[PDB]
């Protein structure tokens, strides 16, 4: 039942995202409501989060692949829909496998940007 509910919610959110994409093409991305400016964000992370690196492509693309278990998939998407991961950057979900990969990539991004600030603050 949880799997079915999560899948339907994702589909509904994606459908709403397409409808909102029509309106951001009319009034720019502010003029919708607060709710439809949180739907867009969590539904611009779902789209980025649906991409997965395949182990078969390790040689060509270099990046190591991921095999996401079904249990992880349901929880990972379920948490995103509720809004638990509303502070993670959008790009952390692009070509990553599982929720843990999202978090580790966030560490590598937050720490990476830390050096950039110390550089840009200095020099």
């Amino acid at each position: 039942v949880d799997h079915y509910n999560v899948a339907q919610d994702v589909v509904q959110m994606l459908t709403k995202y397409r409808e909102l994409q029509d309106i951001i093409a009319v009034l720019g991305i502010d003029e919708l409501s607060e709710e439809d400016k949180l739907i867009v964000d969590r539904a611009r992370k779902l789209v980025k989060f649906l991409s997965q690196p395949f182990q078969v492509a390790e040689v060509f693309t270099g990046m190591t692949g991921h095999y996401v278990q079904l249990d992880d998939t349901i929880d990972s998407f379920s948490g995103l829909l509720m809004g638990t991961y509303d502070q993670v950057p959008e790009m952390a979900f692009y070509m990553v496998g599982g929720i843990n990969s999202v978090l580790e990539k966030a560490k590598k991004m937050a720490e990476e940007a830390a050096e950039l600030e110390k550089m840009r603050r200095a020099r």
Partner: peptide, 30 residues
Amino acid sequence: EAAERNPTGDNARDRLLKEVLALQARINQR
């Protein structure tokens, strides 16, 4: 007021999520 008075795999995600966001706040500070 009473609620304030009173107070494993999922913990790791919470730890990482908290720690991940900990640096995001620190970078903003300085």
